[PDB]
Amino acid sequence: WLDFTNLFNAGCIAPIVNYTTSSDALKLYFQNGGGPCYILPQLDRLTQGFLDSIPELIKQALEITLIVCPEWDSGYQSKIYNSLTSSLLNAGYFLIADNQDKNTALITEVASQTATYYPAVKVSQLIQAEDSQIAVLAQLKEKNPTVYQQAVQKIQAIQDEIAANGNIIPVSAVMAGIYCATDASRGVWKAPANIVLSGISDVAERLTDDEQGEMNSKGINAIRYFSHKGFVVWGARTLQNDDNWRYIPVRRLFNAAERDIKQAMQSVVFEPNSQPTWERVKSAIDNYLYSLWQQGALAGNKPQEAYFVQIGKDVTMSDDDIKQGKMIVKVGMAAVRPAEFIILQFSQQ
Amino acid sequence: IGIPVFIGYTSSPVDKTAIKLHSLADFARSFPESGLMYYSVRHFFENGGQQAYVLSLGTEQQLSDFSSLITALQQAWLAQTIAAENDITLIITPDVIRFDQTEISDTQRDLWLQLWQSVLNLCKSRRGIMGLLDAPDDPTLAAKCLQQFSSADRQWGVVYWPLLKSAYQDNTQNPIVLSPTAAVAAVIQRNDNQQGVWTAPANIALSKVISPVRAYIEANALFNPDGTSLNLVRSFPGKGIRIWGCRTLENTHDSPWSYIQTRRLVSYIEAYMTQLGRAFVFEPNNAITWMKFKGQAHNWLRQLWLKGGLRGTQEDQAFEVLLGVDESMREADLRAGKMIIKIRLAVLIP
Amino acid sequence: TTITTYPGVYIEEDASLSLSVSSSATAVPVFAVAGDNPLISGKPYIRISNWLEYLTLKNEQFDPANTLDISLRAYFINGGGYCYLVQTTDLEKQVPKLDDVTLLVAAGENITTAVSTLCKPGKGLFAIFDGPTTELKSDGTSNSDYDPNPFAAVYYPWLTADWTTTIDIPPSAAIAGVYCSVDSTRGVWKAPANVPIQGGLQPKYPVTDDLQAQYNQGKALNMIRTFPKSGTLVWGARTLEDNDNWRYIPVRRLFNSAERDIKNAMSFAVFEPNSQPTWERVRSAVNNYLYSLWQQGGLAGNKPDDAYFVQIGKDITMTDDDIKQGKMIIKIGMAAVRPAEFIILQFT
Amino acid sequence: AAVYYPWLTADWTTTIDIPPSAAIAGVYCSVDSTRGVWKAPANVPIQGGLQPKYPVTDDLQAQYNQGKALNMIRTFPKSGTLVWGARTLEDNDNWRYIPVRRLFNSAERDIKNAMSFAVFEPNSQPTWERVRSAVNNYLYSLWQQGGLAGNKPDDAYFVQIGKDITMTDDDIKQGKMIIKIGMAAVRPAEFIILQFT
Amino acid sequence: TTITTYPGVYIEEDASLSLSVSSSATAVPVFAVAGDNPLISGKPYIRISNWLEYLTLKNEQFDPANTLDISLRAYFINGGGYCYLVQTTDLEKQVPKLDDVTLLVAAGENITTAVSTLCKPGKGLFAIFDGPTTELKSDGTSNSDYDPNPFAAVYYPWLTADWTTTIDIPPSAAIAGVYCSVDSTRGVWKAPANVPIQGGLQPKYPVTDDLQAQYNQGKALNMIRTFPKSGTLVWGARTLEDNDNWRYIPVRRLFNSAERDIKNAMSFAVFEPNSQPTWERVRSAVNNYLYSLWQQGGLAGNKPDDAYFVQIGKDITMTDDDIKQGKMIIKIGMAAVRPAEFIILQFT
């Protein structure tokens, strides 16, 4: 957060007028254990050129894993989400989105790589900045107070509406910090739910058990308040409802394993395609998966039930593939799913 | 040992950096007399406090409201200063007394929560910093705040209630009301020196306290067996004023952080281990280095065990240290260049 | 998974869940208040922690003509703790909103509708009714108005005291106080019978030994009787269901406490990974809780495996498709200890 | 190769700052003479009372400690000025650290000089016994001092030479003697991770 | 089929279908509302999730003179979940548009036309009717009006309660509540009979043992009777068809859930390749689901082959011309359990 302040002008007013929750949202992200992040500032009107460059700019930064739009306007968020090409999310990138409604779920280009949360969160005080921080105000005051008064009325008009309707912050920014905090404490295989939110005032709308059950089938993760625990995240499901990609930890664990292995294989892309190469490749992946299994990331009593790697002349490839330069490796992982429901069966035996 | 820092408005303006005080004479040398936080500083020293720090947000006259105090506490420069100054351990904000309790509305309840969160944010600048917190005057609001508080930093927060009145008087003959945070902080320093960190600062007598500002019977609902309980300052028949309670803000009953001594003892162990580990930052990662690290750590832990700091009859249940090519890491870890040390502990229960 | 990026020393702390069951309070009652009462009007509920505190909330002296005052002083004189006051028409709303409520007390007015819609399996609540105000009709048909709910009990007759002038204390008010005293001293599994009434209260009508035998079957009426050498005692601990599972109050209340304690404990392990390490921790936590109950005598059996069993695993309770759908299934068996209602002596 | 940052300044310096490589070279000899070549030339003070021109934060070093890393000279509150970081310009596991690369350099140089006295010797069994013993003693000495990692010597190194082990019959007839040497160099404990329960 | 076009590393996932059958709720009712009711007017349907929510949707207090209020409060007092309110004239249109609905409830008015056109084989629906409001005529011919539909049941007589003043609760409203409670506790295969009516309701007319015997054949009438020791119970679980296949409600309702669950699962394999690998996955998914039912006791048999069988193959169920026309045919057999309606004890 200190680094962000030294490089960006923290405030609730966009450069000149518009209202922005980005500065406040980033404060919540660091408050909830978030680590280093990347900022993609948008300047001037929302041109079509910016949309086309979004997948390109993200790919250049090699470490980016999660995509978040901390804006509050629903129309602005929809444009950003659609701008994400299917080839971007399918390459190992996870998107965190905010639902605009309790009843219907979001429409996403890649459902399996998206998590949706509801409702938004409230904070008591926003970040107010002096005139020297707002880009075009101190210079404008000394030059022409007449237009300065004109701008201030709109600024004051923005200020009281936010106070009246309450300080509503999109929740995706908060959840991104929870993802990093969970990954630091437990593994990526641990579901990011059942974690207490920090530095919050209230949720936008209270939910009941019956209401959440309606959304949980649709794939909308809920923010619930429990008296014994406080405000917690209650839900770990993506937007896809099949057996494979249903829970967030299962999908994100594969993204990590694929990206890590793919990065390691870049030093093998021209090695000889013979038996000695296959033995080294198999051992490297086997050791990596064995380490994951011992950390509890894979389900099984013995390694044969948790993971398997297959690479060989007649088990995975053939003579024609070798002649054409193809090297094929088969990797199987049995990820661990969260226990979304605990069922206690009491008998009098 | 716990070196508290005092944050508040001071009549004599000073710079934005803290000062080092070892006696009231040094306090008088830098500061003028008369003021709420000066009275508590005197109370801390008179109870047996040795040394402490003082940090000033501004002058005494520029007190505005509760939100102004919280906003002033959220400035960036305070976090950097306590982070830079290594030996600060406890955070005290006695200036919360100067604000009245007009109503029990949601406006007042939320403000108390933000002050707790803001202080806990200051406690996260460095690891091992404990925050001493206050509670609203009536038990109704305090119980409401305790149940509704939601934060992941509950482990580092300790709250004391109610306010205390002392023999100190202003020019008008009125008893000065002081927060119990100053009094306990001196006790921790005395407990740290005489008895050590692993001794709970409860069931101990305070000094120069006339009576708690409120009574006993109204405080029955604040203590809670499972979690989110308070610590009571309670007068006794024929035993003087006593500190009754050593529980933090931790909610889960199974957590080992539910007691202030256990949280501080582990952090005290952590500080030495980090200090010892700095000497091994670029040592060769072979058997000789592991034996050297194991021997030094085992000897120091054995020394701590023989003082009653650890729960155990033999050494094995008291503690355990693992470091080697096996049982602590793999061959791939050595090539990665990282050394992994696993330490198991067994804390006491008050 | 700490990521090492700069040379130095890194600090890690174990964050794996530690699971254990904690015993809660099993005697928190809720009292029913009439609509016209000014104390309860204009507020969702009132929490009262002492008899003097109730007078503090009031502005008058003790009134022996209002059912609310006599019931509260009868409840407190018999021991107990804090109790909630809820409007009868608002019981269905406020009661689920209070997670600490254990007992529902009629307090001398009709709460039949609230009981049937609240006291259900898994809810953890229990209800105490009031018997008929008239003479106990000899043929044994003065039970038709009651519904055979295994979560409720009826006590007879209404009690009277010296301070009472023209309105008798409902029995449920004093019985709720007895529940807390028995639970605190002997435990929840102990039958709340064969114990004295601490307030010096007297039953309005005498009940003969043979008359009790008429009403002790089926939807039974637990009777408060006076004995020549023991004074006034609570006689009978039967619910309104006569099957072997839930015939006695202690068995039903013991399961209520056990389910509530385990349910609260498991809320800290909801989204935990559903694999072997989690199963080992939940099994150990539940086993210790049931072992503690067997040590205290709450479960019957020569050895622990004869009193309880806990099952959880990949092939014991759930299947592969259950795991893939995010279901963790735990089977718990328990052998509750029953009262020795009848003592039979036979000599040769 | 390795790169060190930033340039150093001293009291006697007026307008030109000392290049870091000049001081680092002196540190290499002092560490080598005291602890050995396999010891990392880091976590050691600068004896000249020199001060870095710019301060480097903990996170800033973390940004430059990957890939073609820049070893950093930093000032610490309780230890003064220290050399922090011992990484080369290659990030693979073989040659990530300076001590591993420099240890192999000294081992190759020492054995190469020793082997020049046995160039035109007869290529038969008696010569193989003498070369095997000489190399084994040198590697055994390194393992005794702690320069190689392993519980037992055969876990730290191996030397192979023979008629059917390393070379064939045609190799001998062409005047080639082949020796295979394996070494398990000890690596710096760049990161220390403490975990408690 | 990844196309290798540039030197590098290629990442893709296995996309073969994974199939599993999940259990759907088996007690979602739809209530029929008269045209003149203002709540339903101007809207296609209303979904109500709780009794308090229904009063929230309304603006008045509880009215004991409107059939809608008594039916809903009788349905919820017996247990249940969300229900839909649809106009009778719009039943044929709105009901097929709701895929979560399972039951059709008359709620005290004529839905005979809607039932005949909605409850058909494969649709998965079921209907609950109301018996005649008058005395049961002795000769046993008070049944000519009803149509012998194997997807419907009739319950007699209408119920009354203390809160009712001049209009009696239709029996189908309370029975729909009983269905949800029985399904949740014991299972859809257990007969919704010999279970109490939880609302404290009483039948309007007493039914003797002989009178029920006259109406228990053919288009039978399930009877609600009061017993001296068990209170009010539901007696009888027969449909309107008397053949061996669909004589009992549990057998018909168990199949209705079975086809619905499997039909939903097979929607993920509509356009999959019609070859051996797909047949193996479909058979395994269905076999696991049926094995789960047999474990819970829903199917009768000593061994799995005695309880169910699944057949699919190139020469088992479909021919070469069937495959070429895009037809995949699966034959499923099920040995549903049946109620022990009559218990006969023989002594020697």
CA distances from D133 to B177, C41, D143, D150, D160 (A): 86, 101, 15, 20, 11
Structure tokens at B125: 């600048």
Residue D83 pairs with which residues in a beta bridge? Answer: D73
8 Å CB contact between E114 and E122 = no
Q: How far is Cα E302 from Cα E296, in angstroms, rounded to an integer?
A: 13
CA distances from A254 to A219, A297, A328, C256 (A): 20, 11, 18, 43
8 Å CB contact between D103 and D37 = yes
From first CA to last CA, the distance across chain D in angstroms is 42
DSSP string, B281-349: TT-B-SHHHHHHHHHHHHHHHHHHHTTT-S--SSHHHHEEEE-SSSSS--HHHHHHTEEEEEEEE----
8 Å CB contact between C239 and C252 = yes
Structure tokens at E259: 């086809």
Rg of the Cα trace of chain B? 22
Q: How far is Cα A147 from Cα C76, in angstroms, rounded to an integer?
A: 72
* Sign for the pseudo-dihedral over CA of D83, D85, D89, D94: positive
Nearest CA in chain B to C7: B281
Q: How many CB atoms lie within 10 A of CB A59?
A: 13
- Chain E residue numbers with beta carbons less than 8 Å from the beta carbon of A258 are 11
SS3 for C146-207 is CCCCCCEEEEECCEECCCCCCCCECHHHHHHHHHHHHHHHCCCCCCCCCCECCCCCEECCCC
Check CB contact of A266 with chain E, cutoff 8 Å: yes
From first CA to last CA, the distance across chain B in angstroms is 20
Torsions phi, psi for B175 (to 5 deg): -65, 135
Amino acid at the residue A267: S
Q: How far is Cα B197 from Cα B263, in angstroms, rounded to an integer?
A: 10
* Alpha-helical runs (H) found in chain E: 51-57, 67-77, 91-94, 112-118, 171-185, 209-214, 249-266, 276-296, 304-307, 320-324
Contact B121 A31 (CB under 8 A): yes
Residue of C171, C188, C166 lying closest to C179 (CA atoms) = C188
For residue A197, give the nearest of B148, B149, B150 by CB distance: B150
Residue of B177, B223, B226, B227 lying closest to B202 (CA atoms) = B223
Structure tokens at B277: 């580990």
Q: How far is Cα C277 from Cα C16, in angstroms, rounded to an integer?
A: 10
Residue of C236, C245, C258 lying closest to C310 (CA atoms) = C258
8 Å CB contact between E28 and E102 = yes
For residue B127, give the nearest of C11, C18, C22 by CB distance: C11
Q: How far is Cα B149 from Cα B249, in angstroms, rounded to an integer?
A: 9
Q: How far is Cα E275 from Cα A172, in angstroms, rounded to an integer?
A: 44
Q: What is the DSSP letter of E66?
A: S
User: Are chains C and D touching, using the cut-off of 8 Å on CB pairs and a minimum of 3 such pairs?
Assistant: yes
Neighboring chains of B (3 or more beta-carbon pairs < 8 A): A, C, D
Q: How was this structure determined?
A: cryo-EM
Q: How far is Cα C34 from Cα C31, in angstroms, rounded to an integer?
A: 10
Buried b (16+ CB within 10 A) or exposed e, D61-98: bbebbeeebbbbbbeeeeeebbbbbbbbeeeeeeebbb
- The three-class DSSP label of residue E19 is coil
Of the residues B286, B289, B291, B319, the best mutation for testing chain D's interface (the one with the most D CB atoms within 10 Å of its CB) is B286
Buried b (16+ CB within 10 A) or exposed e, C286-308: beebbeebbeeebbeeeeeeebb
Whether cis (ω within 30° of 0) applies to the bond prior to D126 is no
Residue C291 host element (H or E): helix C276-296
Q: How far is Cα A247 from Cα A189, in angstroms, rounded to an integer?
A: 10
8 Å CB contact between E263 and E22 = no
Residue C212 pairs with which residues in a beta bridge? Answer: none
Percent of residues in chain E assigned helix, strand, coil, to nearest 5: 30, 15, 55
Strands of C83-87's sheet in order across: C46-48, C83-87, C29-33, C103-105, C126-130, C152-156, C222-227, C231-235
Contact D197 B344 (CB under 8 A): yes
Structure tokens at D126: 């008696």
For residue E7, give the nearest of A243, A269, A324 by CB distance: A269
SS3 for chain D is CCCEECCEECCCCCCCCECHHHHHHHHHHHHHHHCCCCCCCCCCECCCCCEECCCCCHHHHHHHCCCCCCEEEEEECCCEEEEECCECCCCCCCCCEHHHHHHHHHHHHHHHHHHHHHCCCCCCHHHHHHHHHHHHHHHHHHHHHCCECCCCHHHCEEEECCCCCCCCHHHHHCCCCCCEEEECECCECCEEEEEEC
Structure tokens at A45: 């009107």
Degrees (nearest 5) of the Cα angle B150, B155, B159? 80
Q: How far is Cα A88 from Cα A64, in angstroms, rounded to an integer?
A: 11
Q: How many CB atoms lie within 10 A of CB D122?
A: 8
For residue D194, give the nearest of C5, C7, C10 by CB distance: C10
8 Å CB contact between A131 and A139 = no
Q: How far is Cα E101 from Cα E28, in angstroms, rounded to an integer?
A: 5
Nearest CA in chain B to C50: B217
CA distances from B10 to B19, B60, B83, B90, D92 (A): 13, 5, 22, 19, 58
Q: How many CB atoms lie within 10 A of CB E166?
A: 6
HSE-CB for E321 with a 13 A CA cutoff: 0
Q: How far is Cα A70 from Cα A97, in angstroms, rounded to an integer?
A: 9
Q: How far is Cα E253 from Cα E189, in angstroms, rounded to an integer?
A: 7
DSSP string, C125-152: -EEEEE--SS---TTS-TTTTS---TTE
SS3 for A179-210 is HHHHHHHCCCCCCCCCCECCCCCEECCCCCHH
Q: How far is Cα C274 from Cα E308, in angstroms, rounded to an integer?
A: 31
Q: In terms of C-beta density within 10 A (0-12 exposed, 13-18 middle, 19 or more buried), how is residue A223 classed?
A: buried
Check CB contact of C18 with chain A, cutoff 8 Å: no
Return all residues near C120 (Cβ < 8 A) that are at least 6 apart: C151, E79
Structure tokens at C106: 């009629």
Structure tokens at D43: 């976590």
DSSP string, A110-164: -GGGEEEEES-EEES------TTTS---HHHHHH-HHHHHHHHHHHHHHHHHHHH
- The three-class DSSP label of residue C299 is strand
Q: In terms of C-beta density within 10 A (0-12 exposed, 13-18 middle, 19 or more buried), how is residue A263 classed?
A: exposed
Q: What is the DSSP letter of C273?
A: B
Q: What is the DSSP letter of E25?
A: P
Whether cis (ω within 30° of 0) applies to the bond prior to B162 is yes
Nearest CA in chain D to C17: D197
Check CB contact of B266 with chain D, cutoff 8 Å: yes
Residue E158 host element (H or E): none
Return all residues near C220 (Cβ < 8 A) that are at least 6 apart: C154, C236, C238, C239, C240, C242
Residue C10 host element (H or E): strand C8-13
Residue found by looking up tokens 């009063």 in the block: E55
Q: How far is Cα A20 from Cα A41, in angstroms, rounded to an integer?
A: 12
Helix and strand numbers (H, E) in chain E are 10, 12
- The three-class DSSP label of residue E321 is helix
CA distances from C140 to A144, A182, C29, C172 (A): 97, 65, 30, 21
Q: What is the DSSP letter of A329?
A: -
Q: How far is Cα B83 from Cα B129, in angstroms, rounded to an integer?
A: 10
Structure tokens at A58: 């993200």
Q: How far is Cα A165 from Cα A148, in angstroms, rounded to an integer?
A: 26
- Chain D residue numbers with beta carbons less than 8 Å from the beta carbon of C3 are none
For residue A199, give the nearest of B110, B117, B251 by CB distance: B117
- Chain B residue numbers with beta carbons less than 8 Å from the beta carbon of C18 are 254-255
**Residues counted in chain A:** 349
Nearest CA in chain C to B342: C12
Check CB contact of D61 with chain C, cutoff 8 Å: yes
Q: How far is Cα A171 from Cα A24, in angstroms, rounded to an integer?
A: 11
8 Å CB contact between A316 and A328 = yes
Whether cis (ω within 30° of 0) applies to the bond prior to E157 is yes
Resolution (A): 3.1
Q: What is the DSSP letter of A170?
A: -
Residue of E223, E225, E256, E254 lying closest to E238 (CA atoms) = E223
Q: Which residues of C touch B (CB under 8 A)?
A: 4, 7-9, 11, 18-20, 22, 49, 268
* Alpha-helical runs (H) found in B196-254: none
Nearest CA in chain D to C11: D194
Return all residues near C97 (Cβ < 8 A) that are at least 6 apart: none
Q: How far is Cα E197 from Cα E177, in angstroms, rounded to an integer?
A: 9
HSE-CB for C234 with a 13 A CA cutoff: 26
- The three-class DSSP label of residue E225 is strand
8 Å CB contact between A96 and A176 = yes
8 Å CB contact between E130 and E106 = yes
Torsions phi, psi for D26 (to 5 deg): -65, -35
Q: How far is Cα B208 from Cα B202, in angstroms, rounded to an integer?
A: 17
From first CA to last CA, the distance across chain A in angstroms is 58
- The three-class DSSP label of residue E47 is strand
Residue found by looking up tokens 């009215």 in the block: E63
Contact C93 E196 (CB under 8 A): no
Torsions phi, psi for A259 (to 5 deg): -65, -40
8 Å CB contact between B141 and B212 = no
C-alpha E10, offset from chain centre: 51
Number of C/D CB contacts below 8 angstroms equals: 40
Q: Where are the beta strands (DSSP E) in C187-338?
A: 202-203, 222-227, 231-235, 308-311, 327-334
Check CB contact of A98 with chain C, cutoff 8 Å: no
Structure tokens at C115: 């009981």
Rg of the Cα trace of chain E? 24
For residue C268, give the nearest of B221, B252, B338 by CB distance: B252
Number of C/E CB contacts below 8 angstroms equals: 28
- The three-class DSSP label of residue C93 is helix
Residue B166 host element (H or E): strand B164-169
Structure tokens at A320: 């024609």
Q: How far is Cα A91 from Cα A75, in angstroms, rounded to an integer?
A: 26
- The three-class DSSP label of residue B42 is helix
Structure tokens at A179: 């993802």
Contact B336 C4 (CB under 8 A): yes
Residue of E265, E234, E261 lying closest to E249 (CA atoms) = E234
For residue E18, give the nearest of A92, A242, A265 by CB distance: A242
8 Å CB contact between E17 and E269 = yes
- Chain C residue numbers with beta carbons less than 8 Å from the beta carbon of E229 are 218
Q: Which residues of D touch B (CB under 8 A)?
A: 38-40, 42-43, 77, 79, 86, 93, 96-97, 99, 146-147, 149, 151, 186-197
Nearest CA in chain B to A201: B110
